[PDB]
Ligand binder design. Structure first.
Ligand code: CLA
Ligand code: CLA
Ligand code: CLA
Ligand code: CLA
Ligand code: CLA
Ligand code: CLA
Ligand code: CLA
Ligand code: CLA
Ligand SMILES: CC1=C(/C=C/C(C)=C/C=C/C(C)=C/C=C/C=C(C)/C=C/C=C(C)/C=C/C2=C(C)CCCC2(C)C)C(C)(C)CCC1
Ligand SMILES: CC1=C(/C=C/C(C)=C/C=C/C(C)=C/C=C/C=C(C)/C=C/C=C(C)/C=C/C2=C(C)CCCC2(C)C)C(C)(C)CCC1
Ligand SMILES: CC1=C(C/C=C(\C)CCC[C@H](C)CCC[C@H](C)CCCC(C)C)C(=O)c2ccccc2C1=O
Lengths: 733, 32, 80, 159, 82, 95, 82, 141
């Protein structure tokens, strides 16, 4: 309390440098602070969430301002396919003149950075056209962040502090959040689309000054209240429409065309409008479900209690889970993180194949960057979901209240779960690695016709069920006699079939034996990471080796060398181990995506179709082949604009290597070395005049694991980001 | 065709300073 | 400032006391075992956390347990 | 045919690959004496390549665009030899080895010192158990139905 | 024992650097083919003096350049090396 | 360290016992000249106070760095000199 | 080296015949490892430098190498007995 | 028992080392171990090196309690020598520590009271969720 860790006495009284490290590392864990009550915990969390919102909005405002100030948004808008967007300017005093010449891209007057976030396409699609629009948005977002800061400060005041019962009103919070935050927000977005952005793509200009007089439709709101909702879809945009101009432009606002806009190769705007309108209606209806102050609606506890199978196969069913979830913040955090990870993976998978932004899918580097970014985010989020679930088992789980319900019966057959997961992982690993090595041996001996190439007929059958007429399966949407084809042949199927039978886009790419092998390696990675995380979560409360782990908390180094040795015994260590597998799996996924799309964009898909069936093919035709321009960023003959990416590549290799030092070498060596260093310092003339305040010590065991994992992950991310950006920007194809 | 005026930059900087003061107040409230 | 607890499954073999490198443990007269003695931990302020006592305890599960806690210049084993 | 795959005999690219391999082997052969051992070895390799290509073409394998055989494992009656038959043979062999190992473990469990027989194998008993593994599926189903295959009172940790 | 365990890693590091230095310097400045009139052409053309002063130089002109043989050895008598 | 015999522990002399000595400390008061001291105490004595020293250091460093950065001539800094060559086109004709 | 090598052909032409003393059996496509080292011989090229050592020792026939091999086996038996 | 005092007894014959006392002894506690020897013998210093112990009383300054206890354990198990050690503070306070009541800790002695003894098995401890928002640790109960 006296010293820096004001929230911890044990850390405050520590005389070593461990105090600073652990005060930093445990600052944002409010349940562990001294004299912490539930009410203070909830209010502090609520204010911190306000602060996070303010930070997010300031980040967006900064992007907008820097693009409006130093970017060529208007020049890019004039010629989207021939101008490189500008992220921010460069002012580095350490440059030399050749670098200043090399980084002057775009139409800029000085060195700049080319943007790969895709915000140009997103802002252009939603109606923003000039720099004044971006400036207005930046100022507005500054105001919004200020509003959230004021809100946090106010709702922390004694008069305005909410009570603990307010934070536990699940039905009312879910009712408002589901109705407003989802349905009304999507309804407002549909309003923006219809009222502003659709006219922009047809050569109109609608702003705040003429919003009240510019009709979205020639006969506005007449048919809507007359029941003639089909009037708004009469005249869609033509296939010869030019985005941003009135050439071949329709007047419909809610079409249901399906497919892609031919000029921009993205989804129609009116499709997106009807989509967000339907989503808004569904969410607003779904909000009016749970009971509140008006005496109608369902009650979530009664729903959980009623659902319980007779015959006792599930035990007591979902009984008692309401209080377990309401009183545990870690259970809620785990559920939210799992859902968010699934949703992020969905975003990544569904954005590369159905691009929503005009001019995207022609900026190859942006597409690759977006995919990799959100996929790595999803992986980290999933690992966090499992970690905070393990924290729930250790901290908030009460065995007596969850007597014989589903939650306890999960702990009941945990050995069966872990055993069958181990079997699945072993099976996938053995037979997949065996097939890869067998193919390697076959091609090494000069006989590539002896390799085991298995056709992925299930995924091909699914593709044919979608209407792809390449594999000759002739089922469902591929069959003209099917009821589904006849039912959909007028609403959405023309455009959808035209898009899915095109072999130039990324909508249901053609697949072969290599794709089969890679999806199987991905399945191996998923089941193995799940094995590690589930083993950590279920064995968190105790095992045969240490039956009282729940008394030692979530994170602790070990239990000593007794009983054979107990290194890496806590559930935190299972998190630590599973992070490596998560990184490896996401690496496999991104490697596969990037190589397939490189071959697609160069037009040479045969190289992937032939070289992906063996591992030497990967190592030779992906990495070594595509690292040429990257490693030639700077050489004894000068430097290119890829110099920064080459430097980042080497930087990532170096940081990743440095992480190994913390990962492999442990503490006692370093502690003794520091002891010798302290002796040396105390005995040196002109240096004894200076004394340390904190006694130097080596890092803790858990701290060493964390620092090694951090250096490792940073090196991983920076290396792959540099390689991806350079290998896709050197060619742009 | 627009290029952002200098007075616009002045306004943005002043607004950012005010937002920073508000953030300082919120952080002080959280710490105490 | 580690905490050392003794549980009533102790048999009084005195191995933990002999194994302690900082003289934290000692034997105390008791009733409840054939040896009629039990271990005690009065000098827990001098415990370093080596867990030799736990390694020396013969029992299905340990009768002596060490719970690591706040670190001090004595717990850290610093000679400087 | 299936997934737009052509038969190997009908396909072009299979024959192109055969021609390329034979041409490479003959180019290597051009350096040696006609009656020397390297010439005989290279000729043997050439004949083996010809026989392999003929067998693959005549066995009824589908061929991809790149000219290499592909496998079908969805259960098709025309391609059972690709997956289903070797799978059944492997299942028989693996069940045999696993079943005889389990039987030997069970028989050794009731001994004066099971660990000694665990490291030093009782060869006569092992041979008897190994020979009795021909009809392992029948014995396995027998013990599954008789209730002598699974256990109910096993050691577990604190739930 | 653990000190020997770490010394093994550092010995590996040292010897790897030593053998890389030997290989590059020999290929770049000693080994080569000589023709009539006594003109010497080296395997890597004397690039050690300029390209070995940078880590990027090593990565590009030694590991990337000289590994082309091992990764292209499939289908030949050198396939076992790959 | 009493020092009479092989005794090195003595509660009376605890600084000797703990080895708290001054190895090279010299306490001769006469080092410099009187007028040197007059001049240096007159001029260098202003910066004795430490809070004022912190404020002066921070303000002076900020002012110096800003003035040098914003008024440096192009012939010294390449970043202020700016590009002097025609820009290079991108791969697919993208500028 | 006495039975599975091209040491005599190498002796005739040291600068063109690649040394080779290991020959692989034809079983699963291993044939490709038997390279064309020269001297009407197919086998794995060796880098142990035994051909140079034998030439410096004055060995010019396989009979001498076979005699040395027999002597080595006798010495191995003697060491075992000792 | 009446705890003993300290006096001016000779130190062992040692030639010096770099493993001796540091500034911690100056600004914090340091430890002194005393024993009596029947003859001069060579023993290994806990700080590294070999020393000769005098005939009669001996006194040795050490930086940690573990060093004193390791040296005393070696003396007892190898030379059959009884020993004592104390704790010394910078102001001059002396604290007698190892044979607290004159009997070594591995021998049961009357007058000792249990400390930290829990009257249950280790498996009967409570759950961390039961003691939520409370300062107990489930092993202090
Ligand atoms: C209608 C009223 C209403 C509204 C609008 C909100 C809104 C909010 N409440 Mg809330 N609340 C309400 C009533 C309401 N509440 C009531 C009645 C109670 C008491 C019973 C509470 C109690 C409460 C608590 C206790 C907390 C909140 C919090 C929050 C915020 C959540 C963080 C956030 O912004 O998520 C934004 C989420 C979305 C916009 C949903 C988007 C859907 C998915 C995720 C993405 C889909 C969009 C699309 C695909 C992507 C497009 C993006 C673009 C780049 C293309 C949010 C602003 C939390 C907070 O942060 O505090 C400040 C918090 O801790 N509320
Ligand atoms: C929240 C979103 C939102 C908002 C704020 C607006 C706002 C506006 N729209 Mg608009 N619009 C939207 C969504 C939205 N729209 C969507 C999704 C569509 C597609 C169906 C349209 C289609 C549309 C047309 C075709 C026209 C407008 C018009 C207008 C303007 C006058 C509205 C009017 O006639 O009185 C509203 C009159 C009412 C009777 C509505 C009150 C009752 C409603 C139904 C309550 C809604 C439920 C509520 C949440 C509870 C106004 C600027 C008109 C105009 O003059 O624009 C210049 C016009 O011609 N809009
Ligand atoms: C909405 C996102 C979210 C939120 C609110 C939290 C919140 C929390 N996490 Mg969690 N976590 C998340 C995502 C999240 N996490 C993800 C995605 C991962 C996977 C990388 C983790 C992995 C994780 C671990 C492994 C641990 C936590 C811990 C904690 C708690 C203390 C954090 C701390 O000490 O910070 C300190 C922050 C730093 C030192 C920054 C280092 C960089 C706190 C309740 C800790 C805890 O509760 O301890 C029992 C803990 O051990 N989390
Ligand atoms: C690329 C190198 C590599 C390889 C091949 C493996 C292989 C394996 N690891 Mg492993 N691992 C590695 C690196 C690697 N690891 C690293 C760097 C870490 C970080 C510390 C881990 C952390 C780790 C954990 C935490 C776990 C595994 C598990 C497994 C097994 C998964 C089952 C399987 O696929 O059987 C394939 C069999 C083979 C490849 C053997 C070929 C002969 C398998 C033996 C899991 C396991 O044992 O599951 C049962 C498990 O729990 N590993
Ligand atoms: C390849 C990655 C890598 C790197 C860089 C290091 C680095 C180091 N290890 Mg090490 N180590 C590693 C992997 C690595 N380790 C692995 C994998 C293991 C397991 C076997 C070990 C095991 C190990 C042991 C067992 C020991 C070391 C030691 C050392 C140190 C060597 C002496 C020294 O100070 O070097 C000086 C040189 C450097 C630190 C690198 C150059 C400096 C760079 C260029 C940056 C400097 C300027 C920088 C920009 C400052 C500005 C910062 C500012 C911008 C914030 C050094 C900190 C030894 C030690 O403690 O040293 C006495 C030692 O005993 N390591
Ligand atoms: C879940 C996947 C699955 C499973 C378990 C089976 C299982 C089986 N299939 Mg099969 N099959 C599948 C997917 C699957 N199929 C798909 C996607 C196709 C492509 C349309 C086929 C095409 C197929 C054919 C053509 C035949 C089988 C046959 C069989 C049976 C031998 C067996 C029951 C055989 C069968 O039942 O004969 C009557 C047979 O001839 N399958
Ligand atoms: C008697 C032999 C035998 C039998 C019947 C089983 C049976 C089983 N094992 Mg097991 N296992 C064995 C030996 C055996 N194991 C040995 C020796 C090892 C050490 C390598 C393992 C390691 C092991 C792991 C790591 C896992 C299993 C799993 C399993 C289950 C699923 C099958 C599987 O994954 O096989 C896998 C089989 C192997 C990895 C090795 C097979 C070794 C063969 C059988 C030879 C060894 C036996 C012996 C030398 C034969 C000679 C006997 C002779 C004297 C008559 C199943 C209950 C999995 C599970 O729990 O799923 C529920 C699982 O994850 N086992
Ligand atoms: C991100 C901030 C930043 C900025 C703005 C600079 C700016 C500069 N660095 Mg640099 N540097 C940085 C971070 C930064 N560095 C980091 C993180 C590192 C560690 C890797 C380095 C390491 C580094 C080296 C090793 C060198 C520079 C040098 C330089 C100068 C070269 C340009 C020139 O014309 O020199 C002309 C410079 C002068 C004529 C010096 C006059 C400036 C005086 C000293 C200002 C007065 C200092 C002020 C009172 C301090 C106030 C602190 C409060 C330039 C001023 C070079 C240099 O010193 O020059 C040089 O050799 N830098
Ligand atoms: C440990 C723990 C935890 C955690 C957990 C987790 C983390 C989990 C996860 C999980 C997950 C992560 C899951 C996922 C899932 C998913 C799913 C299950 C899906 C499904 C889908 C479907 C079914 C679909 C269908 C379809 C199709 C196919 C097509 C179209 C149509 C439709 C839609 C119908 C918690 C916190 C709880 C707490 C306690 C402990
Ligand atoms: C001067 C003089 C002298 C001296 C002498 C001498 C000193 C001598 C010596 C001698 C000698 C000292 C001899 C020797 C010999 C040896 C030998 C002869 C050897 C051989 C060997 C071999 C042949 C081997 C082989 C092999 C190999 C190579 C490999 C492995 C196997 C084997 C082992 C088989 C005298 C005294 C007389 C006196 C007078 C003067
Ligand atoms: C090298 C190493 C050390 C020694 C390293 C130490 C003491 C770290 C010293 C780091 C100095 C202080 C510089 C840190 C610079 C960083 C770039 C920034 C630190 C974080 C900021 C937020 C301050 C250990 O203590 C250790 C302990 C247990 C297992 C492995 C290891 C281990 O590998």
């Amino acid at each position: 309390a006296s010293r820096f860790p004001k929230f911890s006495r044990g850390l405050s009284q520590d005389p070593t440098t461990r105090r600073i490290w652990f005060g930093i590392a445990t600052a944002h864990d409010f349940e562990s602070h001294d004299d912490m009550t539930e009410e203070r915990l909830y209010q502090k969390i609520f204010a911190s969430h306000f602060g996070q919102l303010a930070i997010i909005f300031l980040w967006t405002s900064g992007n907008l301002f820097h693009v409006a100030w130093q970017g060529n948004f208007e020049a890019w808008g004039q010629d989207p396919l021939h101008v490189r967007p500008i992220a921010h300017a460069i002012w580095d005093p350490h440059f030399g003149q050749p670098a200043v010449e090399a980084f002057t891209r775009g139409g800029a007057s000085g060195p700049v950075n080319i943007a790969y976030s895709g915000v140009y396409q997103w802002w252009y699609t939603i109606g923003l056209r000039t720099n004044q629009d971006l400036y207005g948005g930046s100022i507005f977002l500054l105001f919004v962040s200020a509003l959230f800061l004021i809100a946090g400060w106010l709702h922390l005041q004694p008069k305005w502090k909410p009570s603990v019962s307010w934070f536990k009103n699940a039905e009312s919070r879910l009712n408002h959040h589901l109705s407003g935050l989802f349905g009304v927000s999507s309804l407002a977005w549909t309003g923006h689309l219809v009222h502003v952005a659709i006219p922009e793509s047809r050569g109109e200009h609608v702003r705040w000054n003429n919003l009240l007089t510019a009709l979205p439709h020639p006969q506005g709101l007449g048919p809507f209240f007359a029941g003639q909702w089909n009037v708004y879809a009469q005249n869609p945009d033509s296939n010869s429409h030019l985005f941003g101009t009135s050439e071949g432009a329709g007047t419909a606002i809610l079409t249901f065309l399906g497919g892609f806009h031919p000029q921009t190769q993205s989804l129609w705007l009116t499709d997106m409008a009807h989509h967000h309108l339907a989503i808004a209606v569904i969410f607003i209806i779904a909000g009016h479900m749970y009971r509140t102050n008006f005496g109608i609606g369902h009650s979530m506890k009664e729903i959980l209690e009623a659902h319980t199978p007779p015959g006792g196969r599930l035990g007591r069913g979902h009984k008692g889970l309401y209080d377990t979830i309401n009183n545990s913040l870690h259970f809620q955090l785990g559920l939210a993180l799992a859902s968010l990870g699934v949703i992020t993976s969905l975003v990544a998978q569904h954005m590369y194949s159905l691009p929503p932004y005009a001019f995207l899918a022609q900026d190859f580097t942006t597409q690759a960057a977006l995919y990799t970014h959100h996929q790595y985010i999803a992986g980290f989020i999933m690992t966090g979901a499992f970690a905070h679930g393990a924290i729930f088992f250790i901290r908030d789980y009460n065995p007596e209240q969850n007597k014989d319900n589903v939650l306890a019966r999960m702990l009941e057959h945990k050995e069966a779960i872990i055993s069958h997961l181990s079997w699945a992982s072993l099976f996938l690993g053995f037979h997949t690695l065996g097939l890869y090595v067998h193919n390697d041996v076959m091609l090494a001996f000069g006989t590539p016709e002896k390799q085991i190439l298995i056709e992925p007929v299930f995924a091909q059958w699914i593709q044919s069920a979608h209407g792809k007429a390449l594999y000759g399966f002739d089922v469902l949407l591929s069959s003209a006699d099917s009821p589904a084809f006849n039912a959909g042949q007028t609403l959405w199927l023309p455009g959808w079939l035209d898009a899915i039978n095109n072999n130039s886009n990324s909508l249901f790419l053609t697949i072969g034996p290599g794709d089969f092998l890679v999806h199987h390696a991905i399945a191996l990675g998923l089941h193995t990471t799940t094995l590690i995380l589930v083993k950590g979560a279920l064995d968190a409360r105790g095992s045969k080796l240490m039956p009282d782990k729940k008394e030692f908390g979530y994170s602790f180094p070990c239990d000593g060398p007794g009983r054979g040795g107990t290194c890496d015994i806590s559930a935190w260590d299972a998190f630590y181990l599973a992070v490596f597998w998560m990184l490896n799996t996401i690496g496999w996924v991104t490697f596969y995506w990037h190589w397939k799309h490189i071959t697609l964009w160069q037009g040479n898909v045969a190289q992937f179709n032939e070289s992906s069936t063996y591992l030497m093919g990967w190592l030779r035709d992906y990495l070594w082949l595509n690292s040429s321009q990257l490693i030639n960023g700077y050489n004894p003959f000068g430097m290119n604009s890829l110099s920064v990416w080459a430097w980042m590549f080497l930087f990532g290799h170096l940081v990743w290597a440095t992480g190994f030092m913390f990962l492999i070498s442990w503490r006692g060596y370093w502690q003794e070395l520091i002891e010798t260093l302290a002796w040396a310092h105390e005995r040196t003339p002109l240096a004894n005049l200076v004394r340390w305040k904190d006694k130097p010590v080596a890092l803790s065991i858990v701290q060493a694991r964390l620092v090694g994992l951090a250096h490792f992950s940073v090196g991983y991310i920076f290396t792959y980001a540099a390689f991806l950006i350079a290998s896709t920007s050197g060619k742009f194809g | 065709m627009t290029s952002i005026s200098d007075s616009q930059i002045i306004v943005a900087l002043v607004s950012a300073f005010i937002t920073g003061i508000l953030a300082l107040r919120l952080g002080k409230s959280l710490y105490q | 400032a580690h905490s050392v607890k003794i549980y009533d499954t102790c048999i009084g073999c005195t191995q933990c006391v002999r194994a302690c490198p900082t003289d934290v443990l000692e034997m105390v007269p008791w009733d409840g075992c054939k040896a009629s003695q039990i271990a005690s931990a009065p000098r827990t302020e001098d415990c370093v956390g080596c867990k030799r006592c736990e390694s020396a305890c013969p029992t299905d599960f340990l009768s002596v347990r060490v719970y690591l806690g706040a670190e001090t210049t004595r717990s850290m084993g610093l000679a400087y | 045919d299936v997934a737009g795959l052509t038969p190997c005999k009908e396909s072009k690219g299979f024959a192109k690959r055969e021609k390329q391999e034979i041409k490479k082997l003959e180019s290597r052969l051009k350096l040696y004496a006609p009656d020397s051992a390297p010439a005989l070895a290279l000729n043997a390799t050439i004949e083996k390549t010809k026989r392999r290509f003929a067998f693959y073409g005549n066995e009824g394998l589908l061929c991809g665009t790149d000219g290499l055989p592909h496998l079908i494992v969805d259960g098709d009656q025309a391609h059972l030899g690709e997956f289903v038959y070797p799978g059944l043979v492997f299942l028989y062999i693996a069940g045999w080895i696993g079943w005889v190992g389990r039987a030997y473990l069970i028989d050794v469990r009731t001994s004066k010192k099971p660990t000694e027989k665990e490291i030093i194998i009782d060869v006569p008993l092992a041979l008897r158990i190994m020979s009795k593994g021909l009809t392992w599926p029948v014995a396995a189903i027998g013990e599954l139905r008789s209730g002598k295959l699974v256990e109910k009172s096993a050691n577990i940790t604190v739930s | 024992w653990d000190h020997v365990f770490l010394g093994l890693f550092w010995m590996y590091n040292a010897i790897s650097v030593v053998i890389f230095h030997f290989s590059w310097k020999m290929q770049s400045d000693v080994w080569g083919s000589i023709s009539d009139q006594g003109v010497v052409t080296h395997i890597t053309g004397g690039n050690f003096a300029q390209s070995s002063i940078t880590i990027n130089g090593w990565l590009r002109d030694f590991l990337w350049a000289q590994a082309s043989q091992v990764i292209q050895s499939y289908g030949s008598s050198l396939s076992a090396y790959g | 360290k009493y020092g009479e015999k092989s005794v090195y522990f003595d509660l009376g002399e605890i600084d000797n016992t703990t080895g708290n000595w001054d190895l090279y400390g010299n306490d001769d008061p006469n080092r410099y000249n009187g007028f040197q001291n007059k001049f240096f105490e007159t001029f260098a004595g202003a910066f004795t106070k430490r809070g004022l020293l912190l404020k002066f250091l921070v303000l002076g460093g900020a002012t110096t760095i800003g003035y040098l950065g914003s008024t440096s001539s192009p012939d010294l800094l390449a970043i202020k000199n700016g590009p002097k060559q025609v820009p290079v086109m991108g791969p697919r004709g993208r500028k | 080296g006495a039975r599975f090598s091209n040491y005599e052909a190498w002796l005739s032409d040291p600068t063109h015949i690649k040394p080779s003393a290991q020959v692989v059996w034809p079983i699963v496509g291993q044939k490709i490892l038997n390279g064309d080292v020269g001297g009407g011989f197919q086998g794995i090229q060796i880098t142990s430098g035994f051909f140079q050592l034998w030439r410096a020792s004055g060995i010019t026939s396989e009979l001498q190498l076979y005699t040395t091999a027999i002597g080595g086996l006798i010495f191995a038996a003697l060491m075992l007995f000792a | 028992t009446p705890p003993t005092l300290n006096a001016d007894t000779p130190a062992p014959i040692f030639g010096g080392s770099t493993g001796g006392l540091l500034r911690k002894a100056q600004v914090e506690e340091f430890y002194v171990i005393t024993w009596e020897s029947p003859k001069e013998q060579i023993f290994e210093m806990p700080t590294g090196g070999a020393a000769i112990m005098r005939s009669g009383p001996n006194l040795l300054k050490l930086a940690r309690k573990e060093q004193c206890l390791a040296l005393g354990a070696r003396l007892r198990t190898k030379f059959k020598i009884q020993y004592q050690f104390y704790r010394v503070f910078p102001n001059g306070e002396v604290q007698y520590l190892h044979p607290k009541d004159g009997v070594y800790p591995e021998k049961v002695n009357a007058g000792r009271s249990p400390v930290g003894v829990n009257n249950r098995s280790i498996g009967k401890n409570a759950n961390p969720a039961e003691l939520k928002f409370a300062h107990k640790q489930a092993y202090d109960l």
